[PDB]
């Protein structure tokens, strides 16, 4: 069977204890899980369901609904690239080109080392600094390939 590591289970229990009702913590718990594993393992949902005192059904539906969660590909670093109107107008395509030159991958793909996955996303709410991308929680303006290369070198 699947069991949560003790360090993870602790964090999960903290989130569950944070709000007045346990089930309010479901998104924070899923964030925590994806942070820990680099994706949401399908096997994780049954024991999380129990901790939330929710049907598995409910948890599965929630995972499928929210775009940030990924059940399919494990990646250490998610490069979220905005493909919305402002970023498009100001040069999403040059960012994607630079990413392909550096990493060898296109949107939706993972590097063969499991290290980077490019995730196309809607507006990241930084449109004045378009074109925008994130690397996990860090968010940046794309300037040029040389600049992107330097930024990515910080993620090991």
């Amino acid at each position: 069977e699947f069991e949560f590591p003790e360090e993870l289970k602790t964090k999960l229990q903290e989130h569950i204890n944070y709000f007045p009702k346990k089930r309010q913590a479901i998104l924070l718990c899923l964030h925590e899980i994806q942070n820990y594993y680099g994706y949401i393992p399908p096997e994780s949902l049954k024991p999380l369901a129990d901790m939330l005192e929710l049907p598995l059904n409910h948890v599965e539906g929630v995972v499928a609904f929210y775009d940030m969660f990924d059940r399919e590909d494990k990646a250490k670093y998610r490069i979220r690239v905005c493909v919305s109107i402002v970023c498009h107008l100001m040069g999403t395509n040059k960012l994607l080109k630079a990413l392909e030159n550096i990493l060898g991958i296109k949107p939706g793909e993972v590097t063969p080392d499991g290290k980077f996955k490019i995730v196309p996303v809607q507006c990241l709410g930084a449109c004045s600094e378009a074109p925008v991308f994130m690397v996990n929680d860090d968010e940046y303006k794309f300037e040029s390939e040389v600049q992107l290369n330097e930024i990515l070198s910080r993620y090991t």
């Binding site: 009702k21 998104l27 929210y66 109107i85 507006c123 930084a126 449109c127 600094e129």
Partner: protein, 418 residues
């Protein structure tokens, strides 16, 4: 230590909401206190809840979340229903072009917190929530830390400053859905469910979180509240035009020299926003269109309108995306179509299939692969996303695109021949 955030430019002619947030860094409680912070809170707790509601009403404050609803009036509707009541700060900000709320959150979180406490007190809520989009992780950590700072200084908890008023503020995180900014879907999300809007009525002010009276207010709305108390309603209402008084934040992006957030009075025109404040266009090219987020499309003939909530005003969230003469409107329209395709929650049939088909067909048009039937179908589906829709998304998913068809016919005709 917080995650990296781009340093969005911010400028103010009023020095209120952006007094600290014009500087791109976290202002912690000590700086806030040095500027007289939390003194509005202290004054508020010496007033009755009902007096506070009256002040906010008389201030003419309207919501900054898109609908421009009078904030005092919303509060009054909530309090006419038996408690307990809940207060929710909507920090889901996910509409394209819109980045005004994040600079308050990330740079002056105590302004927002002070507003939440005064508002919660006004409506008798002992539990408040901030729902912040999942793609603002820095905002989330900054808010958690600021809340703890406030607890330590006795602005949160039980019996705040000996007033008898109890408040806890909980920070919830979204997980990638624009629809969770819609007030009923936001509440569904807070309850641990999928972000599915609910049939209204009832409205949240009557039945919201756990079926109780619930006030949902946008970040920017709430950030006005400390000023209204501090200055008094009458002095606040002297700011800008007397019917749409007070500061407004305008996030300006696209082909301008100085893209960023501007704090301005609402008698400012759209032309002034672009040319006086945002420094004009890149390369000094002619303005072709302004997209009000993903909601409306203004032509170059419509730049002399006020940035107010009047019928002929700009309205919305004051989001200004500038396109210049060389930008392809059809390519732009496609991006808008793609947004709505990706964000419909699917509950309503015309919205579900219409947002999908609108983007699918427009792509075919753009790539020069559309049949005559695809063209006629595109037109039809664009006019038929709204029927039976239960929230604002279905109502507006066709609107901007329809406006580009009306205002830029010659550009569309080039694709039709193609």
């Amino acid at each position: 230590s917080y995650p990296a955030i781009p340093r969005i430019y911010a400028e103010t002619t009023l020095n209120m909401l952006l007094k600290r947030a014009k500087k791109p860094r976290v202002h912690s409680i000590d700086e806030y206190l040095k500027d007289g912070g939390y003194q509005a809170l202290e004054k508020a707790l010496n007033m009755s809840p009902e007096e506070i509601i009256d002040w906010v009403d008389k201030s003419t404050l309207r919501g900054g979340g898109g609908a421009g609803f009078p904030t005092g009036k919303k509060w009054k509707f909530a309090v006419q229903n038996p408690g307990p009541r809940y207060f929710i700060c909507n920090a889901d900000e996910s509409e394209p072009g819109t980045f005004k709320d994040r600079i308050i959150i990330e740079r002056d979180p105590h302004l927002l917190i002070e507003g939440i406490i005064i508002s919660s007190y006004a409506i008798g809520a002992n539990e408040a929530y901030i729902y912040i989009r999942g793609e603002y992780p820095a905002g989330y950590y900054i808010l958690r830390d600021a809340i703890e700072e406030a607890k330590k200084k006795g602005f949160l908890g039980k019996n705040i400053l000996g007033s008898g008023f109890d408040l806890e503020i909980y920070v919830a995180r979204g997980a990638g859905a624009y629809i969770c900014g819609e007030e009923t879907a936001l509440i569904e999300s807070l309850e641990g469910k999928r972000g599915h809007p609910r049939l209204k009525p009832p409205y949240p002010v009557q039945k919201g979180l756990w079926g109780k009276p619930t006030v949902v207010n946008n970040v920017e709305t709430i950030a006005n509240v400390p000023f209204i108390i501090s200055m008094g309603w009458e002095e606040y209402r002297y700011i800008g035009p007397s019917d749409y008084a007070g500061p407004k934040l305008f996030p300006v992006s696209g082909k301008v020299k100085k893209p960023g957030v501007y704090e301005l009075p609402m008698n400012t025109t759209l032309r002034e926003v672009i040319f006086k404040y945002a420094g004009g266009t890149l390369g000094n090219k002619k303005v072709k269109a302004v997209f009000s987020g993903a909601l409306d499309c203004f032509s170059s003939e419509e730049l002399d309108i006020p940035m107010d909530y009047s019928p002929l005003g700009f309205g919305g969230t004051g989001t200004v995306i500038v396109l210049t003469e060389e930008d392809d409107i059809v390519e732009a329209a496609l991006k808008i179509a793609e947004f709505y395709e990706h964000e419909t929650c699917g509950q309503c049939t015309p919205c579900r299939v219409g947002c999908y088909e609108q983007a699918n067909l427009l792509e075919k048009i753009y790539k020069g692969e559309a049949t005559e039937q695809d063209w006629e179908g595109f037109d039809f589906v664009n006019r038929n996303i709204q029927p039976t829709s239960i929230c604002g998304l279905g109502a507006v998913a066709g609107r901007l695109i329809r406006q580009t068809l009306e205002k830029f016919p010659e550009e569309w005709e080039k694709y039709r021949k193609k």
